[PDB]
Amino acid sequence: LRAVVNEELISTAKVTNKKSLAFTGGTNGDQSKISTAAYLRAVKVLNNAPYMYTAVLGLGCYDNAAITALGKICADRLIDGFFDVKPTLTYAEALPAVEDTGLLGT
């Protein structure tokens, strides 16, 4: 729990005995459709984490922008990176997707 207080009226405020007040309205949206902005924001959060780690994991993103941002993190901190391509692709379609990731090069 966290609380927020209004400074105008707390000079004269009262509290009474209440029982079993239940929270309502808290929902999780459709999580199968998440924009790339959320992934980029969370990658930016991960970059400035004050903790120390020695590996970066894809964890099933399958988004090219997020993958290349994670690769930039790996090249910045000098650590290892383990990324994955979509497993539902066939053998013939897997090869172009690697170039589509944008990590190929030097």
Partner 1 sequence: QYSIQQSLGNASGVAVSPINADATLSTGVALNSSLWAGIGVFARGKPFTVLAVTESNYEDVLGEPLKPSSGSQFEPIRHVYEAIQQTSGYVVRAVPDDAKFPII
DSSP helix/strand/coil, 17: coil
Query: What is d(CA 41, CA 62) in angstroms, rounded to the nearest whole number?
Result: 16
Q: 4 is written with which tokens? A: 């927020």
Q: Which is nearer to partner 1, 46 or 85 (CB)?
A: 46
Please report whether residue 77 would count as binding partner 1 according to CB under 8 A.
yes
Rg (the chain; Cα; Å): 23
Please report whether residue 78 would count as binding partner 1 according to CB under 8 A.
yes
Please report whether residue 101 would count as binding partner 1 according to CB under 8 A.
no
Please report whether residue 76 would count as binding partner 1 according to CB under 8 A.
yes
Name the site residues for partner 1 (rule: CB under 8 A).
52-53, 76-78
